[PDB]
Amino acid sequence: AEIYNKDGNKVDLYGKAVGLHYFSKGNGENSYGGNGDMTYARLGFKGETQINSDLTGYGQWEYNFQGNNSEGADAQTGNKTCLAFAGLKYADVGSFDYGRNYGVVYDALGYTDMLPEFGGDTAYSDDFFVGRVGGVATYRNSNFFGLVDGLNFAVQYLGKNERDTARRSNGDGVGGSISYEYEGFGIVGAYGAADRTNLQEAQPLGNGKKAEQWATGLKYDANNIYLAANYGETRNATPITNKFTNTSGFANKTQDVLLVAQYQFDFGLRPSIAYTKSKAKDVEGIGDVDLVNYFEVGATYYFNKNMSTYVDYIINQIDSDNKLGVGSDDTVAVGIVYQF
Amino acid sequence: AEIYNKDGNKVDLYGKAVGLHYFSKGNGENSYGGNGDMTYARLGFKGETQINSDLTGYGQWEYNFQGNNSEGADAQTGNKTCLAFAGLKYADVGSFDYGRNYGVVYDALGYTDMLPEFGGDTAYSDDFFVGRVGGVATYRNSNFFGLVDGLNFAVQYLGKNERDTARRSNGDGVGGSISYEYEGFGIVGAYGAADRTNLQEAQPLGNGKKAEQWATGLKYDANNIYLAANYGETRNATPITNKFTNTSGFANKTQDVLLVAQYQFDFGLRPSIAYTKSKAKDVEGIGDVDLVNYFEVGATYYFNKNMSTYVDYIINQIDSDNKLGVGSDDTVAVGIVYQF
Amino acid sequence: AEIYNKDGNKVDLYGKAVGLHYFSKGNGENSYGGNGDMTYARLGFKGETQINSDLTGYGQWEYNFQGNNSEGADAQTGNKTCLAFAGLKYADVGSFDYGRNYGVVYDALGYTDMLPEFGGDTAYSDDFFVGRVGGVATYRNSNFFGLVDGLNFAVQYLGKNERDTARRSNGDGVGGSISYEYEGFGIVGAYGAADRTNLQEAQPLGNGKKAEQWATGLKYDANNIYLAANYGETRNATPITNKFTNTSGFANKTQDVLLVAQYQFDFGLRPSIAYTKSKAKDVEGIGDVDLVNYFEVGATYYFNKNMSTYVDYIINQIDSDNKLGVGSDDTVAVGIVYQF
């Protein structure tokens, strides 16, 4: 909600309180999304100041407060800063920002990350260019310097992040994306390559000294209709765990497909149908193994712009004999969202 | 403070900075409330949107930021989300909300939780239905569907919470409350029963497979006078620790009494007199043992609605030979509160 | 940004998102400030209510959210409450506040804590009276009860803080400061002494049962010019670590000097030149050893009151043969700040 706007500076303080619950049989250990209370809340700010006609500065921070922990020792479980960056936009020259933000490849995966509760399975966090990462400098150009309506691109420089964990670490890398949007249609290509750290390399699964990820996307967004499709692949970048051996590392190779179809009724009901499948290839020891594979049926109902509720149903296609131990049960999510 | 209100959506951003200090002799280990700096702050939001004349959506999140930790390793000690839920209210049909909220039995104990700094000893956190708990779905009806002025009730469904700790865990359960308020008078009955988890059962103290708690309350609230009284009992629900043996679990049985009397002077001074006593019965090994037993004398002075200060004095009646090791010394709290 | 102001209560919600990066050769282990992403954000509130013409209540809380952590286990690294206190100001009698706040000696060191990114090396946290500490009651008088324009003083009572760490602990103590400001000129004297805890005393480095710190400051602040100088000393108060032996404790004695010179161009560029040197004396085993020693060249450019960017360059004068293992390499910080 825009709580401030004077002297060319507008601050938008936003947040949401999400009562959420997952239903999966068993202890949800073998299900797709787990089971039980998953209530959480968000608080963030978006600032933007007009330094003059052509120049605009801006910043953004968003935090995630888990609402399903006790007031005991576990209170902070899952709490984190999702985004934190500052930047400048200049006329038709482009924008530049630095901090914790979205890797460029997500310019592609963003297409199908529209399910009510699940979806976007491939957009992992602290996983190079696919989701939110720390220390990224991103330059974005829109309408090709104002010369070509609808043609945008971006280049991104990822700074090395040597964390205590191979999963949350990365070496230096560069990525870019080019997208074009013409009247309801949108197409995108995104790609990035980076150095893997010593620790990532010391891992049991995955072999290389460079991590790659690229995805293409296609969408039709108009007339209350939303259809979107993504296809991407990766090399030594996707994190995987052998539940049997308790081994971990990265998939040597993966091929990922994501399809989504939705319709927004004028009365507020937005049904959703989706399909996701991500399969790993050449996993040292297993061979080919599915990591994600399901159908999604779900719906969201918007009471207005501040209140909504939804049910998300995952019809897990993963089979019980999956070699990595990936869960095979279904999961149903019911949620009620207040937001401002 | 209501920082936003447009298009039927009002957001109230609230908070407080509490400079606080406890005075108890010794290392406060044997005193009632401990000793030293207890400064803290709160930040939360309350949102409410009018979806139409009869239907209102709302949400709320409140966080506790300890102000007595260092900027070192201990910085987060005591930090937690107190509340986090979203819900809908419909005409005279009732309200429904889900998330981390107050168990129904607190509809009763709320009566005497009015002391300046202490009090409300029996309203424990993550302790079934008495205080704040996670994953509760609560339905509330007011004025009996609009047919009976002053007659309200609630039913609450507690979802199983299997935490790493027996103290912060719970199985499924249901609770309800009925209250009636007629001109300054208010009376309430609240009750809830739930399943105890494997871990709670694996504990040394307390024996059963079901946890119960019920409390009744009576109050006179008018003419600057506030008198309130609670009486409740519990079975295998109250957490207790043998300080000698370092054993823990739940009291097989407890009988709890709470009395409070206060007066609000027109100039801002609100003196307080209270009495609390909670005794455990059949504790495996000890027999009967008091857990809480004191008199309270204290006062609050309101400079206005945003600023206040108070002194809370606990005249601990617990004796030095208390079998569980419960402290016997007094404690004095002085605080200065700014809030918005 | 003042987001609220009605009925004599104004709330100022403020914050900033800082995209930040350090450049130092090697793994920054041997450099002055380290190396890599240092992005962070702040959120805080400042409230002030007019209880009547002479009496004002107020409160303040400020939090630090690191933006360079992952969403994994390390998410909370560096997160902390910087300030949290409430207080009252009365006519010309003075103000009083309690909570986590700035020790009195910082009334002096504040003079030279003006560098773009570094500087203020001696103003440590949870280190008695020099930086932010918990549980301090502070009385401040301005203009000597209104009788002497420009003559102010303060007295501060530090409550014992017995933490799990010798570095973040302290016993009781008192401190004061007197400053005088006449037309662009400002001079200050600050001093405080306190008890060291058992644990601080059980440390390998530093010998005494009392901690002292005093600093004087002098400044010329006018006509776009800012020159400031500090000199202070300490006994058993400055925390130091022998990187070789991995030993720790406090410097028996230190002499600290800080000089700063800056100029604010009308177009927004504020160049900075500074010099800092802190040397420890009588360190058990080493003798005399520099702890901090460098020149600083840096600049900040203000686009407006909400947006800025800067480069801070430390020309480390510490030499590679420094006995404690203090780093000798340079560090360069580049940052882009959005704030409201």
Swiss-Prot record, chains A, B, C:
Periplasmic compartment residues: 7, 52-53, 92-93, 142-149, 183, 223, 266-267, 304-305
Effect of loss of the gene: Leads to decreased susceptibility to a number of hydrophilic antibiotics including ampicillin, cefoxitin and tetracycline. Deletion of ompF confers resistance to colicin E5.
GO biological process: monoatomic ion transmembrane transport; protein homotrimerization; protein transport
A Pfam match: Porin_1
One term of GO molecular function: colicin transmembrane transporter activity
Keywords: Cell outer membrane, Ion transport, Membrane, Porin, Protein transport, Signal, Transmembrane, Transmembrane beta strand, Transport
Record-given protein name: Outer membrane porin F
Organism: Escherichia coli (strain K12)
